[PDB]
Ligand binder design. Structure first.
Ligand SMILES: Nc1ncnc2c1ncn2[C@@H]1O[C@H](COP(=O)(O)OP(=O)(O)O)[C@@H](O)[C@H]1O
Ligand SMILES: Nc1ncnc2c1ncn2[C@@H]1O[C@H](COP(=O)(O)OP(=O)(O)O)[C@@H](O)[C@H]1O
Ligand SMILES: Nc1ncnc2c1ncn2[C@@H]1O[C@H](COP(=O)(O)OP(=O)(O)O)[C@@H](O)[C@H]1O
Ligand SMILES: Nc1ncnc2c1ncn2[C@@H]1O[C@H](COP(=O)(O)OP(=O)(O)O)[C@@H](O)[C@H]1O
Ligand SMILES: Nc1ncnc2c1ncn2[C@@H]1O[C@H](COP(=O)(O)OP(=O)(O)O)[C@@H](O)[C@H]1O
Lengths: 78, 131, 308, 217, 348, 51, 133
């Protein structure tokens, strides 16, 4: 449900591990370039957005980075 | 590999947009203050008109060279160049609708003597429908 | 201020004391060597200028005690929040459609501030000079900082903050750094001296989904386009500042509750008085009330029978 | 007093006019343009805005009066001393000055055929107020405004355009539809108002706007 | 040989003494009369610290004062008053054509109503707080086209005293960024200077809202211009002397924020001529043309409705056209009758 | 550089061009355009979209 | 800044000076200035004065509110500024490097403030008070 575990569980276990926590939620001001940053960080965690209510919103980028992530410099976790 | 002696007599030159002629005329550098200036020493007063662009120096801000217009993104379109190797003997299976296409596309050739002869202007457009 | 930042050397006579990371400091002509820090020269403190009371605001009670609660009370009683534990909310975001309680509540907040209620309309943050604006709005923020306690009021943000920008031609290459460093400026004041950034905008459907995030605003105040138990109070106030001859009725036109602001209550009541100026009358009796209301008492809608 | 005729004149021609006419030779070679924004009076003096996007105050100097100084014209200025030397008549781009067709008449009214009441109607509606307005004014009715020609796919629209503009004996401008819409906010708007400003300056002239479907959604 | 050269030559010695002058850059003093030195803001320029004239009137150098500065040495010179743009090509001139309410036909309710709401607070303001309410500010002249909108404000232009700021709303906007907001704050501050004033912004769909989501360059530049125009129609005062009125087609594309009573209170619906107003327009544009006597206006008005004032002067214009290619004396009844039945062909 | 973003410049003897890595802003081409030393790294890209 | 000059408009065609006078091989050596110094050639500016002119150019307040309300004031900033000096010596004792991050340009300035405060009263709460005696 909206609330109850989001943006906070994926935050907390990102930073017990001291990994990083990249959020690509929203595309306001600047895809594929973010992967380079994540690669540079070496280990990384990419987080997403959940909007339906409190057509192809962010499942497009979701897969867009699972296409690069499937064949893939390895410890990045969407 | 020895152009050292000639670089000082080159005068790097800023293109500006010419406009009206009173003589005097008004240039427009598109970053500077579109100001008034005459011709140098050798360029004709009938060589520079409105609309076109001329080069301005930066020392005493005056024109020496008239310059061609700008085509910035359509430079690559142009008329391709070289051109592929297939020809009329390749594209087969039609034999007549080439000849309709052929007589319109091929009148800067032989053909203008026929057309200034028996008073024809050739068609300009050709359209090519097909599945 | 001439465009870029660039490296310097600062002289020894100035102390390394007042050099805050937004301290306006002077440079030397033709050399650019730093010479002396300056008082915060920048926007106006708005000395006693706006005047509507918080008593003739009409109707608005819960929003009035929320804005009274989260703006001027943590400026006065700054330490009771440091005796219970809950922080003062940093910003105040006011989304009102189409606008009832925006700018008389942000106008009647400006009396009993005893605080530098600095105004700026959020539309001259863009300027013809390139790279000007971010320096301007950080001058606004520090101009509230050295005048604490202050209330920054910036209107209609969706002028400077939207969801959709454009990477190419730079009509908005600078407004994506109007919002960006202002978004960095508000995070630079978590040490909580006294600066509260209240802000209003007609619509917040496209504001930005990074303008809140518990730090830049922490709040949201809905303005209701009021109804039955409030509409009566609006009519009671606006009629209470007029001449009436009691042939009028109050709750008859509180009835038919259909889609009114407070602004069109001021329009039908103001229009009632002005329609009474026809016969050069110093009061209003029956028709100018009903008359103006019906004329522009919502100039109707478009029902639609069958369904309904 | 008979020595005072022209000998004291020529020392001021050489001094006053070698200096003053020297910077008045700088009316041409280094000379600059500007737009004055106001003209105020101090116990004249103007504020110009030179087109490097900056604006200077100056006491108004010679070769320009307080009458031939309208706030918002195109008046030039020196590039180092910044004093307004002489005026220039008002300007704009060549994208509007490209509409200056001179090679109009080769399609006369004999090449058009089968539309002769539209030729009578249009030619009556346009070039008859160009040669007979006063007789028209003796009836006391307003000159008719712009004529919209319209037809299915391709009849005689533009051929009546350069056929009417062929034998008009006026000036004429072949303004397209999509020349008026560009990427900037300012340009589309600036150039129609300066198009009608051109037509007012060079009036009497008629204007053909081809294909209004550009500005017709 | 001497008085001629003395007058029209020695008068032209002025070119050298005026040629000696140097010109002065302008700027705005961000106040802080740091006593001996002030901080001013140049126009396209940096803020910086400037010395002073040494016997200037420092006590009235208010924050936000146009001041002139030296170029080379850069000390502040003689001050300036607050500038004006070519708003001189706005206020000082418009379209007031000695047109009066005599040419306005058949809408005496709308023009008596607009005249009373717009200049009657400027005639007798004391009767309004007498009743107990401030006067309204704006009127929105929404209607089908033709119909006397732009003109109506022509008749208002040639019958009032204050500087009738008549502007087309699409000569406002310019290609530079943040420029239109400069122009509209310059306009309304100019209205603050000369009072009471009337600001006529017709056709306003250029600045007209129903604000978008996605065009992001050519529209958000104006949807922040409408923010400045909107937050100075509103302001923190009520502008207290100036009254703007706006006339447009398509009121159903305007912004709700700019329509909420307050920015525009008494929205006036100017309407097509019914029958009485039809014969009014027909008589007024049939006036200066020579006529008949017992020319049947009533069958012309009876004939086909749904016209406009522009369409009825189109009727008299086409009938005078019929005589001018037909070579008659004035018209006949069949020339009005042949005139309406070709205007009635002109549907959409 | 900040206002107008490009040039190719030199580096002084006491700079050891080997460590100066990309997106680590520091310059000194005072007039002739030649480097001197290094400065505060100035928070790389993501530091941005996080803060 | 005072300097006279010459007529070296022309005549590019003696004065041992002890080696060209010194301080005009140190002007503000700027090209338009030194290009002006081709014509200019400044030399010296001497100075005279007399002893007379030289020589020519060369109380209380006690508990009004004065003595109290500038030792009721400054000892309070000695209290909490000495608390921040406590925080300074506790803090910088360990994990301190690079000259205390460049002397805390930010949050200026602890400790020195105490020295200044100490200096202010001991020139006042003695001296004219001394003359009270
Ligand atoms: N189990 C929980 N423990 C702590 N906080 C929680 C919990 N569930 C919800 N929250 C609250 O939710 C907020 C975080 O938002 P989040 O849960 O990411 O939104 P969403 O519910 O949309 O995922 C925090 O302020 C937190 O207090
Ligand atoms: N008469 C023909 N002779 C040879 N090749 C042909 C002929 N007609 C079609 N083709 C083949 O069709 C291809 C041309 O594609 P094209 O017609 O351009 O497709 P499209 O019309 O979708 O662009 C070539 O590979 C060509 O060999
Ligand atoms: N709750 C209210 N009580 C009294 N007057 C109101 C109320 N809401 C609006 N008004 C009046 O109607 C007008 C419109 O105000 P509003 O649109 O809310 O301002 P803004 O759009 O700046 O928030 C104001 O001038 C105000 O006097
Ligand atoms: N009535 C006509 N008289 C002469 N030429 C005509 C006529 N109708 C069509 N044309 C021919 O059509 C061409 C012009 O087409 P036009 O009517 O201008 O198309 P559009 O109206 O879309 O511009 C000319 O080559 C012309 O010879
Ligand atoms: N009542 C009227 N009386 C006379 N002319 C009118 C009337 N209504 C409209 N018009 C015509 O409209 C023109 C003015 O333009 P207008 O109708 O305001 O269009 P817009 O509203 O687009 O400006 C006038 O030249 C006039 O002929």
């Amino acid at each position: 449900p909206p609330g109850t575990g989001k943006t906070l569980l994926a935050r907390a276990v990102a930073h017990h591990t001291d990994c990083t926590f990249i959020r690509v939620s929203g595309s306001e001001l600047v895809v594929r370039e973010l992967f380079v940053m994540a690669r540079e960080h070496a280990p990384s965690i990419i987080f997403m957005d959940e909007i339906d209510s409190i057509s192809g919103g962010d499942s497009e980028v979701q897969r867009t980075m699972l296409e690069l992530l499937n064949q893939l410099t390895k410890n990045i976790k969407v | 590999a020895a152009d050292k002696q000639t670089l000082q007599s080159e005068q790097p030159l800023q293109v500006a947009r010419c406009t009206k002629i009173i003589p005097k005329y008004i240039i427009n550098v598109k970053q500077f203050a579109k100001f008034v200036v005459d011709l140098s020493d050798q360029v004709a007063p009938t060589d520079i008109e409105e609309g076109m662009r001329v080069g301005v120096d930066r020392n005493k801000y005056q024109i020496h060279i008239p310059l061609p217009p700008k085509i910035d993104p359509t430079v690559t379109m142009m008329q391709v160049e070289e051109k592929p190797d297939v020809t009329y003997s390749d594209v087969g299976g039609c034999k007549e609708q080439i000849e309709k296409l052929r007589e319109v596309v091929e009148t800067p050739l032989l053909h203008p003597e026929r057309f200034v002869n028996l008073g024809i202007e050739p068609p300009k457009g050709v359209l090519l429908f097909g599945p | 201020t001439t465009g870029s930042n660039y490296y310097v050397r600062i002289l020894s006579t100035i102390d390394r004391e007042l050099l805050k990371p937004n301290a306006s400091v002077a440079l030397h002509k033709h050399s650019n060597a730093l010479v002396d820090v300056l008082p915060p020269e920048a926007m106006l403190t708005s000395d006693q200028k706006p005047d509507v009371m918080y008593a003739d605001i009409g109707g608005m009670d819960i929003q009035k005690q929320e804005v009274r609660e989260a703006v001027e009370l943590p400026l006065t009683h700054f330490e009771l929040y440091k005796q219970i534990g809950i922080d003062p909310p940093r910003g105040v975001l006011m989304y009102g459609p189409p606008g009832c309680g925006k700018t008389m509540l942000a106008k009647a907040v400006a009396h009993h501030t005893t605080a530098a209620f600095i105004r700026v309309v959020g539309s001259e943050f863009v300027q013809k000079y390139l790279g000007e604006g971010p320096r301007m709005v950080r001058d606004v923020f520090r101009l509230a900082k050295e005048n604490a306690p202050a209330i920054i009021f910036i209107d209609e943000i969706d002028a400077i903050a939207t969801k959709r920008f454009d990477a190419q031609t730079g009509a908005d290459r600078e407004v994506q750094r109007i919002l960006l460093e202002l978004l960095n400026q508000m995070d630079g004041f978590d040490q909580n001296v006294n600066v509260k950034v209240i802000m209003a905008t007609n619509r917040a459907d496209t504001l930005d989904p990074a303008l809140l995030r518990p730090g830049r605003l922490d709040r949201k105040i809905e303005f209701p386009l009021p109804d039955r138990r409030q509409k009566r109070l609006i009519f009671s106030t606006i009629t209470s500042k007029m001449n009436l001859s009691e042939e009028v009725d109050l709750e008859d036109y509180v009835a038919r509750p259909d889609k009114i602001s407070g602004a069109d209550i001021n329009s039908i009541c103001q229009e009632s008085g002005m329609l009474a100026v026809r016969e050069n009358r110093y009061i209003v009796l029956a028709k100018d009330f009903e008359k103006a209301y019906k004329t522009v008492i919502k100039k109707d809608e478009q029902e639609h029978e069958f369904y309904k | 007093e008979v020595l005072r005729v022209t000998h004291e004149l020529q020392a001021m021609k050489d001094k006053i006019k070698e200096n003053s006419e020297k910077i008045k030779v700088n009316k041409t070679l280094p000379y600059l343009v500007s737009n004055v924004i106001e003209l105020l009076d101090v116990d004249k003096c103007a504020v110009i805005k030179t087109s490097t996007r900056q604006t200077y105050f100056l006491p108004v100097i010679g070769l320009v009066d307080a009458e031939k100084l309208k706030p918002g014209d195109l008046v030039g200025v020196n590039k180092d001393s910044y004093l307004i030397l002489e005026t220039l008549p008002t300007e704009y781009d060549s994208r509007v000055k490209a509409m200056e067709v001179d090679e109009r008449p080769t399609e006369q009214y004999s090449d058009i055929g089968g539309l002769d009441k539209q030729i009578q109607e249009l030619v009556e509606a346009i070039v008859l107020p160009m040669n007979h307005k006063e007789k028209f004014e003796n009836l006391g009715i307003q000159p008719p405004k712009g004529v919209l020609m319209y037809g299915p796919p391709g009849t005689g629209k533009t051929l009546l355009a350069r056929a009417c503009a062929a034998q008009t004996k006026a000036t004429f401008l072949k303004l397209a539809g999509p020349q008026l819409v560009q990427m900037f906010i300012g340009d589309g708007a600036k150039l129609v108002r300066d198009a009608f400003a051109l037509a007012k300056e060079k009036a009497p002239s008629i204007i053909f706007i081809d294909e209004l479907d550009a500005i017709g959604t | 040989q001497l008085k001629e050269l003395t007058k029209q030559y020695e008068k032209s010695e002025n070119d050298l003494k005026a040629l000696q002058s140097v010109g002065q850059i302008v700027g705005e003093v961000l106040k802080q009369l740091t006593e001996e030195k002030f901080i001013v803001k140049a126009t396209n320029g940096p803020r910086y610290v400037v010395g002073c004239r040494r016997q200037l009137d420092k006590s009235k150098l208010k924050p936000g004062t146009r001041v002139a500065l030296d170029m080379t040495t850069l000390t502040i010179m003689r001050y300036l008053p607050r500038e004006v743009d070519p708003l001189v090509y706005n206020m000082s001139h418009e379209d007031p054509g000695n047109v009066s309410y005599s040419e306005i036909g058949g809408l005496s309710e709308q023009i008596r109503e607009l005249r009373e709401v717009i200049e009657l607070p400027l005639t007798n303001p004391e009767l309004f707080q007498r009743v107990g309410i401030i006067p309204p500010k704006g009127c929105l002249l929404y209607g089908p086209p033709g119909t006397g909108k732009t003109l109506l404000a022509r008749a208002v232009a040639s019958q009032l005293d204050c500087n009738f700021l008549k502007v087309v709303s699409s000569s406002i906007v310019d290609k530079y960024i943040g420029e239109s907001a400069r122009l509209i704050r310059e306009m309304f501050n100019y209205a603050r200077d000369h009072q009471p004033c009337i600001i006529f912004m017709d056709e306003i769909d250029a600045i007209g809202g129903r604000r978008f989501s996605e065009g992001t360059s050519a529209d958000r530049e104006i949807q922040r211009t409408l923010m400045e125009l909107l937050n100075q129609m509103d302001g923190f005062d009520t502008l207290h002397r100036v009254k703007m009125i706006m006339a447009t087609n398509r009121p159903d594309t305007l912004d709700p924020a700019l329509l909420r009573p307050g920015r525009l209170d008494r929205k006036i619906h100017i309407d097509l001529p019914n029958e009485q107003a039809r014969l009014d327009i027909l008589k007024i544009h049939a006036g200066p043309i020579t006529k008949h006597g017992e020319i049947d206006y009533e069958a012309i008005v009876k004939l086909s409705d749904g016209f406009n004032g522009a369409d009825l002067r189109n009727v008299c214009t086409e009938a005078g056209m019929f005589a001018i290619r037909a070579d008659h004396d004035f018209v006949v009844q069949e020339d009005f009758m042949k005139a309406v039945r070709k205007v009635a062909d002109s549907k959409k | 550089v900040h206002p107008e973003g490009k040039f190719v410049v030199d580096v002084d003897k006491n700079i050891d061009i080997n460590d100066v890595t990309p997106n680590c802003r520091v310059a000194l081409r005072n007039d002739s355009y030649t480097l001197h030393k290094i400065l505060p790294n100035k928070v790389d890209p993501l530091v941005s979209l996080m803060m | 800044v005072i300097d006279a000059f010459r007529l070296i408009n022309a005549n590019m065609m003696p004065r041992q000076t002890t080696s060209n006078l010194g301080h005009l091989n140190k002007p503000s050596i700027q090209a338009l200035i030194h290009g002006l110094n081709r014509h200019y050639y400044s030399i010296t500016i001497n100075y005279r004065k007399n002893e007379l002119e030289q020589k020519m150019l060369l109380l209380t307040l006690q508990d009004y509110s004065e003595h109290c309300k500038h030792n009721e004031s400054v000892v309070k900033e000695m209290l909490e500024l000495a608390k921040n000096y406590n925080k300074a010596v506790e803090e910088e004792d360990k994990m301190t490097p690079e000259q205390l991050a460049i002397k805390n340009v930010g949050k200026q300035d602890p400790k020195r403030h105490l020295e200044e405060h100490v200096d202010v009263l001991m020139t006042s709460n003695i001296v004219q008070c001394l003359a009270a005696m």
